[PDB]
């Protein structure tokens, strides 16, 4: 269930398609926060027309290693 959640988050709430065309300039991100009390500041500008929590799990590099282009496969 946890592994499926990481794949679903990378499929919907991430910028994997934007990072795939520029791996040396866009930072990975796979988590977006809702604007309740403040909290917009956490949604950092990670680049690629997207803003969210920058992840350090390496899921994007792993999804790069075994071919995965679109989000439909995720």
């Amino acid at each position: 269930i946890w592994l499926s959640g990481m794949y679903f988050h990378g499929a919907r709430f991430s910028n994997y398609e934007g990072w795939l065309s520029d791996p040396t300039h866009i930072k990975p991100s796979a988590q977006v926060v809702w604007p309740i009390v403040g909290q917009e500041i956490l949604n950092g500008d990670v680049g690629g027309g997207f803003q969210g929590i920058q992840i350090t799990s390496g899921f994007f590099q792993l999804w790069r290693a075994s071919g995965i282009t679109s989000e439909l496969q995720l």
């Binding site: 009390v37 403040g38 909290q39 500041i41």
Partner: protein
């Protein structure tokens, strides 16, 4: 059977290392020594008192000697603002080439260390101006110390040992202590202030060779024996007046001027004499209250028996309290420690606001070190007062003697007292932590306006009621028509108002929303430490989990792992737990003092006022910013004067971490480990020839708590002293 614990045959018959350690622990518990009577106990206490006085006078004599030999006192008098005080010289064969070159400061020929005790300003204020007067006074203090040592031995001899009633005589003791020790000594001090300190401050040299030929006042006692006592306050020292010479001096001695001095930023020396004189007259007239062997006076037992309100407010009132207090020693010790611990904090709070020594406000490291030193000393003494109160309740509290009085009456609702203390502590903790975390999160979300800021409208009102016209409360002492303002308008109100309205001194500092939360944090620490100590003192002789606790003493490990487990159940354990809270409370009050003064001294008072609301601001602008020069004492590019402080700054961290070991790990694990080491030493070749005289054993449970607390307290003290003196000395004078 060894013979080292001469006072205890039980520990003397111990075949382990426990005999050595415990031999150094119960060495002063004269109440539990083999074959000890009440008379022998009181006489032993009377001797140890003289030994303490002798070592105190010897210590101060050594301080005068070291400053007179290596300190630049004569060089500091001619320029008390630029030059730095010198404690003593440094002789270390371990020092290198750069250590000798870098440790030489203050205009010296060899390496020395600057003094933070602030004794130079004190001696310069009282009148010491030469390097010889400290020498002759140091030999005088050594002589009086020798006399005290002889006196202590003298009274430990037959036909010279005092009886038991002599010790149990409160009327003459209070009469003599209030008249001679408190009053005659104060009269002699104001005599020295008017005969030496006042003329030396005006350039007129007065010493033992010419004090009998120079009159303190032109009139010369003629007004003291005449109805013209105001002649001693005719011309006070003017504003434009140097403290070393007679430029702009006066001839008055007993004045009454509020505020400070324009050049030294301290109180007027012609006011402390008047103060000590009024205090001397009050104490001497108050020392004739109790009844000695005459036909006048009061009786303490009669006053205590007569103080009982009707309509059963306190039941028996104070009946039996005289015999309860006089018959017990821990009660008197707890009362004395409570009074001393309270006045020590009073000394700390008044010395920074109202500096009494000349050129003391300029020395920034001296003020910080003196305030921190006096506050930590007050905290330890305050913990000792409650510890001795618990010892009193366990050792000498007989319930049949004082039945139904206030002492036995406060014990009936100990659950109510402890529960209400618990409620106050929980309230302050929840709300101070919540306000700090709310301001922190709101500040972290890039929005400082959202954070809650409460203005202390009560303390600001008090400051406006005492003279500060910055807040705007048109109240008395800050108005122009109040009876309190017209009263004293010609006595001390102009100087007091001029000193309180200035925003550069430390007299009634301007408070704001950042002091509100810190004051609440101080209140939280005080109520929590009081809760632990009061609970350990009231529940000392029994509880519902252990009703016969009074039959187990004061410091026992536990009462087994039964009935759920009774770890840390003695009153000693309760005091042990309260030492940590005392350290935390004193650390909070000193962090507050040092940061407010650290931001006031550098003209950036707006830094603390806007960055002291959130804990991240505290950690960044206080612990991280002011520690830039301390850790740079020794780097791979050399070293400097602050390197010693940098070394002890890490030394304190190491002592603290070693204390965590004795606090976390318990005795059984270590007992098995020591057993394996014993087998190793017995079955090893060429080293089995030697053998231990006493069997090696692990430290006890109570001993482990005491050693861990000692390591924790030593690290907590050394680390903060290093950071305080380094951060202040490093960027200021």
């Amino acid at each position: 059977t060894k013979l080292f614990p001469k006072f205890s045959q039980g520990l003397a018959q111990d075949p382990s290392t426990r005999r050595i350690w415990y031999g150094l622990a119960t060495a002063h518990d004269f109440e539990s020594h083999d074959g000890m009577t009440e008379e022998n106990l009181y006489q032993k206490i009377f001797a140890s008192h003289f030994g303490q006085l002798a070592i105190i006078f010897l210590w101060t004599s050594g301080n005068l000697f070291h400053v007179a030999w290596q300190g630049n006192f004569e060089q500091w008098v001619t320029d008390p603002i630029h030059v730095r005080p010198i404690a003593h010289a440094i002789w270390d064969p371990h020092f290198g080439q750069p250590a000798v070159e870098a440790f030489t400061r203050g205009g010296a020929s060899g390496p020395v260390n600057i003094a933070t005790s602030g004794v130079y300003q004190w001696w310069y204020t009282i009148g010491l101006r030469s390097n010889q007067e400290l020498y002759v006074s140091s030999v005088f203090l050594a002589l009086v110390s020798a006399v005290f040592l002889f006196a202590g031995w003298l009274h430990l001899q037959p036909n010279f040992q005092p009886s038991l009633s002599w010790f149990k005589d409160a009327e003459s003791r209070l009469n003599h202590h209030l008249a001679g020790l408190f009053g005659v000594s104060s009269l002699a001090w104001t005599g020295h202030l008017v005969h030496v300190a006042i003329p030396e401050s005006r350039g007129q040299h007065v010493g033992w060779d010419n004090f009998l030929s120079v009159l303190p006042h032109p009139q010369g006692l003629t007004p003291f024996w005449s109805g013209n006592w105001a002649a001693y306050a005719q011309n006070p020292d003017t504003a434009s007046h140097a403290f070393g010479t007679a430029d702009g001096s006066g001839t008055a001695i007993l004045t009454f001027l509020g505020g400070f001095h324009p050049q030294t930023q301290s109180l007027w020396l012609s006011d402390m004499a008047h103060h000590h004189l009024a205090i001397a007259v009050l104490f001497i007239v108050a020392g004739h209250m109790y009844r000695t062997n005459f036909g006048i006076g009061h009786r303490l037992e009669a006053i205590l028996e007569a103080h009982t309100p009707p309509a059963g407010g306190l039941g028996a009132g104070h009946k039996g309290l005289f015999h309860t207090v006089n018959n017990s020693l821990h009660f008197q010790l707890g009362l004395a420690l409570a009074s001393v611990g309270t006045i020590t904090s009073l000394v700390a709070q008044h010395m920074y606001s109202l500096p009494p020594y000349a050129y003391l406000a300029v020395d920034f490291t001296t003020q910080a070190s003196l305030y921190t030193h006096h506050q930590y000393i007050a905290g330890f003494i305050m913990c000792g007062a409650f510890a001795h109160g618990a010892i009193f309740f366990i050792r000498d509290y007989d319930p049949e003697q004082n039945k139904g009085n206030v002492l036995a009456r406060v014990l009936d609702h100990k659950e109510a007292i402890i529960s209400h203390l618990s409620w106050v502590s929980l309230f302050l903790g929840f709300h101070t932590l919540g306000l700090y975390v709310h301001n922190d999160v709101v500040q972290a979300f890039g929005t400082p306006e959202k954070q809650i800021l409460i203005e202390p409208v009560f303390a600001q009102w008090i400051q406006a009621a005492q003279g500060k016209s910055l807040y705007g409360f048109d109240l008395l002492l800050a108005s122009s028509s109040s009876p309190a303002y017209s009263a004293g308008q010609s006595l001390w109100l102009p100087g007091w108002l001029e000193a309180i309205n200035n925003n550069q001194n430390s007299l009634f500092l301007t408070i704001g929303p950042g002091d509100f939360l810190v004051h609440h944090a101080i209140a939280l620490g005080l109520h929590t430490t009081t809760l632990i100590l009061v609970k350990g003192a009231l529940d000392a002789r029994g509880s519902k989990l252990m009703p016969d606790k009074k039959d187990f003493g004061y410091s026992f490990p536990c009462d087994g792992p039964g009935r759920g487990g009774t770890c840390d159940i003695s009153a000693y354990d309760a005091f042990y737990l309260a030492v940590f809270w005392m350290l935390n409370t004193i650390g909070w009050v000193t962090f507050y003092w040092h940061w407010k003064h650290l931001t006031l001294w550098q003209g950036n008072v707006s830094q603390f006022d806007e960055s002291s609301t959130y804990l991240m601001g505290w950690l960044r602008d206080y612990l991280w910013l002011n520690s830039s020069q301390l850790i740079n004492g020794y780097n791979p590019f050399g070293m400097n004067s602050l390197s010693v402080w940098a070394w002890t700054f890490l030394f304190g961290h190491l002592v603290y971490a070693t204390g965590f070991m004795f606090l976390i790990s318990w005795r059984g694990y270590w007992q098995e480990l020591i057993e394996t080491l014993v087998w190793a030493h017995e079955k090893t070749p060429l080293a089995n020839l030697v053998y231990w005289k006493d069997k090696p054993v692990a430290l006890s449970i109570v001993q482990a708590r005491l050693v861990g607390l000692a390591h924790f307290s030593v690290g907590y003290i050394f680390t903060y002293a290093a950071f305080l003196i380094a951060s202040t000395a490093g960027r200021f004078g």
